[PDB]
Amino acid sequence: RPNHTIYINNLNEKIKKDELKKSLHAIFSRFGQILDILVSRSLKMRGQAFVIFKEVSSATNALRSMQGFPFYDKPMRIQYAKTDSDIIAK
RNA sequence: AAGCGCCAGAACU
RNA sequence: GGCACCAUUGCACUCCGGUGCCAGUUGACGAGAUGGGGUUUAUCGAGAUUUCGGCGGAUGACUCCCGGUUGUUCAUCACAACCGCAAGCUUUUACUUAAAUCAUUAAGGUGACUUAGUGGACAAAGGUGAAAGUGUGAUGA
Ligand SMILES: N[C@@H]1[C@@H](O)[C@H](O)[C@@H](COP(=O)(O)O)O[C@@H]1O
Ligand SMILES: [Mg+2]
Ligand SMILES: [Mg+2]
């Protein structure tokens, strides 16, 4: 079902880790306070992000509102995290 | 203040 | 680390697909050492290392000079070795001669790395005094 962490994909792979990590924070900061955004660039983890909210309330609203939103010329695909994240789980 | 200087090899980011 | 091109729609949380091409970073730790000219592969140890490879320089070495020291107390030549404030050869002997490494803890940088402090060290080539044996002939005052 729902989760503190939201899984975003279909992100522009041409954008560098830190720029993407900050450009994400710009738009998701209104829904609630973000604990950490996790972005890698490997073959397995590129075009994806892990915006973690302290509140699931924020995660639900962010999912509803930002679904399909144009981000670097590419529409976002937002799900919930399949499993909890460590800064929540621990 | 001369085992001292710079850097298309090469290792490393 | 970054651009590009191929490949990838991918649920991760100690970094990490392939191909090129550009940027960056590392690249000698101190001791030692300059009369002039030419020549050549330029002294010494420390360090587990790239202190590798290339280029340049260089106070080294050889060798011909310029001066000087010393050669049976003085000079001027021969001849021999020597010195460029320091000066004939050999030997035994005594004293003198660092900084990195390290280990630390601070700054900076995505980054490999950088610059700086603290801790105690640990050399060799040299250098110094001491002895011991010793080093031409010709001519002149
Ligand atoms: N003092 C050193 C010398 O001992 C060394 O011969 C020379 C050449 O160095 P390299 O052999 O790295 O070219 O450099 C310096 O001058
Ligand atoms: Mg490869
Ligand atoms: Mg070299």
Full domain range(s) for residue A85:
1-90
Tokens 């590129």 belong to residue: A46
Tokens 């560098």 belong to residue: A16
The resolution in Å comes to: 3.0
CATH number, position A63: 3.30.70.330
Structure tokens at A25: 């924070």
Residue A6 class from Cβ within 10 Å (0-12 exposed, 13-18 middle, 19+ buried)?
Answer: buried
Single-letter amino acid code for the residue at A61: N
What protein residues sit with their CB closer than 7 Å to strand C?
A 5, 7, 9-11, 13-14, 16-17, 38, 40-48, 50, 74, 77, 79-86
Structural domains counted in chain A: 1
Q: Between the CA of residue A47 and those of A32, A38, A62, A69, A86, what are the distances in Å?
A: 23, 11, 18, 15, 21
Q: Between the CA of residue A14 and those of A47, A71, A77, what are the distances in Å?
A: 9, 12, 17
Experimental approach was: X-ray
Q: What is the largest CA-CA distance in chain A?
A: 36
Within 7 Å of a protein beta carbon, the nucleotides of strand C are: 2-4, 7-17
Smallest CA–C1' separation from A44, nucleotide = C10
Tokens 């609630």 belong to residue: A32
Structure tokens at A15: 């954008």
